Write a protein that binds this ligand. Structure first.
Ligand SMILES: CC[C@H](C)[C@@H]1NC(=O)[C@@H](NC[C@@H](O)[C@H](Cc2ccc(O)cc2)NC(=O)[C@H](C(C)C)N2CCCC2=O)Cc2ccc(cc2)OCCCNC1=O
Lengths: 99, 99
């Protein structure tokens, strides 16, 4: 799909067998999902953007379906204002910026 | 041009007569530029990132050139680690997300 930026680039994803809305964020190195229960082990981590640092749970090798496209990677779960799909998963589905 | 996401999408921009490196952020509603002495009238504003909010100064109708592409719009100046080009300016240069 070719997505324009007149509106926030939000898409439906499926993670942990659950449907959610996430933002395709080219300015994010990583993927940060709102607090939820994900199968498997996790290691505590700390990330920081504008506004400050937050504590997150790091889940590895998690399957995520973005708009029908499969990806399997690291997902950070924490107190984020929005679900963010970062470059680690965007590269897996072959997403690019064009102008 | 087509930009892959293996690395952060950093490009050269021109603002206030100066050249800077900025991140193309599809997850940013606004454009946030690092602290600089831009002339003109402004208004206080608070924007939120992943870890909280920061105080910024809002400047309107600021001419910004992105990768040789002219644009003009609102720029928020504040204490940011990186210059961020948001959707308000990306739409003007016809940027899209494709996968
Ligand atoms: C500041 C940019 C704009 C203003 C902001 N958008 C972003 O920050 C969006 N993009 C995040 C991106 O700007 C930001 C840029 C950046 C890069 C390196 C740094 O050292 C510091 C900041 N990236 C990150 O915060 C990501 C994080 C999401 C994993 N980080 C942290 C360090 C490395 C990295 O990539 C994400 C978001 C979207 C909506 C949000 C909050 C956050 O709430 C709704 C409110 C609207 N907020 C926004 O539109």
């Amino acid at each position: 799909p070719q997505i324009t930026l007149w509106k926030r680039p939000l898409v439906t994803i499926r993670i942990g067998g659950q449907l959610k809305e996430a933002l395709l964020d080219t300015g994010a190195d990583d993927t940060v999902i709102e607090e939820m229960n994900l199968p498997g082990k996790w290691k505590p981590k700390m990330i920081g953007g504008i506004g400050g640092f937050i504590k997150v749970r790091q889940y590895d090798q998690i399957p995520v379906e973005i708009a029908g496209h499969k990806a399997i990677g690291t997902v950070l779960v924490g107190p984020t204002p929005v679900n963010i799909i970062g470059r680690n998963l965007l590269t897996q589905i072959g997403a690019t910026l064009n102008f």
